[PDB]
Design a protein around this ligand. Structure first.
Ligand code: CA
Ligand code: CA
Ligand code: CA
Ligand code: CA
Ligand code: CA
Length: 664
């Protein structure tokens, strides 16, 4: 059983009907009591309580509940009192009701329900509103989208069993030629393969595709379809592979940032409460490093909150090892990171017809005088590669006998100046400066230290070292030594050597590495007391092993000690040490995703971490910023463009957009 709401307690409907009637007596009502009663009884039990409440007081419990309760709490409670099928039927009903259509709700349900759930959905809709749900959906939908919904609606997907190795091989071929191999995608073929084959088969097919092709099936889909249809197809894919991970995602997006998408929050927490909430919880904590529970807590309030938390659970015997579903998703994130062929692309490309003489002039004319023309500067610099900017710098000083850097630092100011000068600096020097500004001054800007050092490559590090010695007349190691100390200094200096192995995998050694990991974390038995960590062995592995090899270690680690390394590190480790290793891990797992996260974080909450924003935007400008934006939009349901637009203003907002890739 993977449902959160315990499979029944040992009740009697009559005692609850009396307890609930009681809670609703007098002025007001005992919300805590109603909440505690209804959220600790399974749905079946709740149907009986309804039956009892009816025979004892001759009334409708739900009606009485709608009377005493209001708002989110009302909705949620009542939502919990209706049978699953009747539940889905009103969500779809309401999704279709009104002029606007909630396509997100439609997708989530039609993409996640099994053949049987589908049948009971249709049947309940027929009884509740006395109407055909298929005609209603066709009446509110259009195109390939409506086609796929209608197919999913039939509830006739092949059963899981007879695995035709050959048919799997065939569907991979058909899917590859219907997509990757042509401009656009054969929608029809995808609607047929993904809508009829069993979930079992489709999984086997997605794996063969990823292995046979250098990419996941989704990579061939994303950006090759259009509108709601793309979103829909992407959702059946995620559901086939893992519906619990899908809901884990939908849950995260409903609480993204300012505000909540309550209705969705209600739909999921309730509908999945007796199916796979526990699985959802596990996956959620592996992809968001923050309880489903914690986020439900910090984004809701009152008895409404109370209930949601109940429907989830968030302390049932601490963390504990993975269950099948989550272990697969975890294992697969690594597999993917390990074998996927990905094109790393930046957003700033060399300008064509590049004329340094023309730019150098324009830049000067834009500054020459009392005023100062920001647009010319911003528009020129942001749209010119770094290599091209150095040329402009040489040409500028040759034409006017004055340094372009010095003039710019004079004509512009604020966040813009930090961003413009930043672009103007050669890469190895820019990071050297940032490293310099994280140690220079009182205290240490740890975050910026980890970011740079757990992220840059050997070639980049060797360069940063020289760039550093040349600009500040000192080595990077020693500069590190002064500003920091303890374990943090050690890991920071190891990484900064830029000697990390660049060699291939190696199974045997991976298992040995993971073993020390298992030890570093798992410390039960008599040494139950957290004996912290196990030697410098762990640090050497995370700091000096090759990325391809680490992905192996982390994969074997999961096979072995049933946890994910990132999880356990947060366990036995803390502060700058915990954070340094986690950054390392995330860097090898999905570097682009790591920068996306940091961006989200820098504009999340109260104000803006203007420094982190530009550091990333500048240094990733010509590497993987496009990949970054792809990840960003995927995980945060919002484009990088929109985020920047709502967190910054002025010319800074101007220069930032001009640097950022194509909206999204
Ligand atoms: Ca009352
Ligand atoms: Ca929110
Ligand atoms: Ca001026
Ligand atoms: Ca300092
Ligand atoms: Ca903000």
């Amino acid at each position: 059983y993977r449902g959160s709401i315990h499979d029944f307690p040992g009740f009697d409907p009559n005692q609850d009907a009396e307890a609930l009637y009681t809670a609703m007596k007098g002025f007001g009502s005992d919300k805590e009591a109603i909440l505690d009663i209804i959220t600790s009884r399974s749905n079946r039990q709740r149907q009986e309580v309804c039956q009892s409440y009816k025979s004892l007081y001759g009334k409708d419990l739900i009606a009485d509940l709608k009377y005493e309760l209001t708002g989110k709490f009302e909705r949620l409670i009542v939502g919990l009192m209706r049978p699953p099928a009747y539940c889905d039927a009103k969500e779809i009903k309401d999704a279709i009701s009104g002029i606007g259509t909630d396509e997100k709700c439609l997708i989530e349900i039609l993409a996640s329900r099994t053949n049987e759930q589908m049948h009971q959905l249709v049947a309940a809709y027929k009884d509740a509103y006395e109407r055909d749900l298929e005609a209603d959906i066709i009446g509110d939908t259009s195109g390939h989208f409506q086609k796929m919904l209608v197919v999913l609606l039939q509830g006739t997907r092949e059963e899981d069993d007879v695995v035709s190795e050959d048919l799997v091989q065939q569907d991979v071929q058909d899917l590859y030629e219907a997509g990757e191999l042509k401009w656009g995608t054969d929608e029809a073929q995808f609607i047929y393969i993904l809508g009829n084959r069993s979930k079992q088969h489709l999984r086997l097919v997605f794996d063969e595709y990823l292995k046979t092709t250098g990419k996941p099936i989704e990579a061939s889909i994303r950006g090759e379809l259009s509108g709601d249809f793309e979103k829909l197809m992407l959702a059946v894919v995620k559901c086939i592979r893992s519906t619990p991970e899908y809901f884990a995602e939908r849950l995260f997006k409903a609480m993204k940032g300012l505000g909540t998408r309550d209705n969705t929050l209600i739909r999921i927490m309730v509908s999945r409460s007796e199916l796979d909430m526990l699985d959802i919880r596990e996956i959620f904590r592996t992809k968001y490093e923050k309880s489903l529970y914690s986020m439900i807590k910090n984004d809701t309030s009152g008895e409404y909150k109370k209930t949601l938390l109940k429907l989830s659970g968030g302390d049932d015997d601490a963390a504990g090892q993975f269950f099948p579903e989550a272990a697969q998703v975890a294992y697969q994130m690594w597999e993917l990171s390990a074998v996927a062929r990905v094109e790393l692309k930046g957003d700033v490309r060399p300008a064509n017809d590049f004329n340094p003489d023309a730019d150098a002039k324009a830049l000067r004319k834009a500054m020459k005088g009392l005023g100062t023309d920001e647009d010319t500067i911003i528009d020129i610099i942001t749209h010119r590669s770094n290599v091209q900017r150095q040329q402009i710098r040489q040409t500028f000083k040759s034409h006017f006998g004055r340094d372009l850097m010095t003039d710019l630092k004079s004509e512009i100011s604020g966040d813009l100046a930090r961003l413009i000068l930043g672009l103007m600096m050669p890469p190895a020097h820019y990071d050297a400066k940032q490293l310099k500004k994280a140690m220079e001054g009182a205290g240490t800007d740890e975050k910026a230290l980890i970011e740079i050092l757990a992220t840059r490559t050997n070639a980049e590090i060797r360069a940063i070292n020289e760039a550093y010695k040349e600009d500040y007349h000192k080595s990077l190691e020693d500069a590190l030594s002064s500003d920091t100390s303890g374990h943090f200094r050690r890991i920071l200096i190891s990484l900064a050597t830029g000697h990390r192995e660049e060699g291939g995998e190696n199974l045997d050694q991976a298992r040995e590495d993971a073993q020390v990991a298992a030890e570093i974390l798992e410390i039960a038995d008599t040494p139950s007391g957290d004996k912290t960590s196990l030697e410098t062995r762990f640090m050497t592995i995370l700091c000096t092993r090759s990325y391809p090899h680490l992905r192996r270690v982390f994969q074997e680690f999961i096979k072995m000690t049933n946890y994910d390394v990132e999880h356990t590190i947060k366990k036995e480790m803390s502060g700058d040490v915990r954070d340094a290793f986690v950054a390392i891990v995330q860097s090898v797992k999905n570097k682009p995703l790591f920068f996306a996260d940091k961006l989200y974080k820098s504009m999340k909450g109260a104000g803006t971490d203007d420094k982190t924003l530009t550091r990333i935007m500048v240094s990733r400008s010509e590497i993987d910023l496009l990949n970054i934006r792809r990840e960003f939009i995927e995980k945060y349901d919002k484009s990088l463009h929109q985020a920047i637009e709502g967190d910054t203003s002025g010319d800074f907002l101007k220069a930032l957009l001009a640097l950022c890739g194509g909206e999204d």
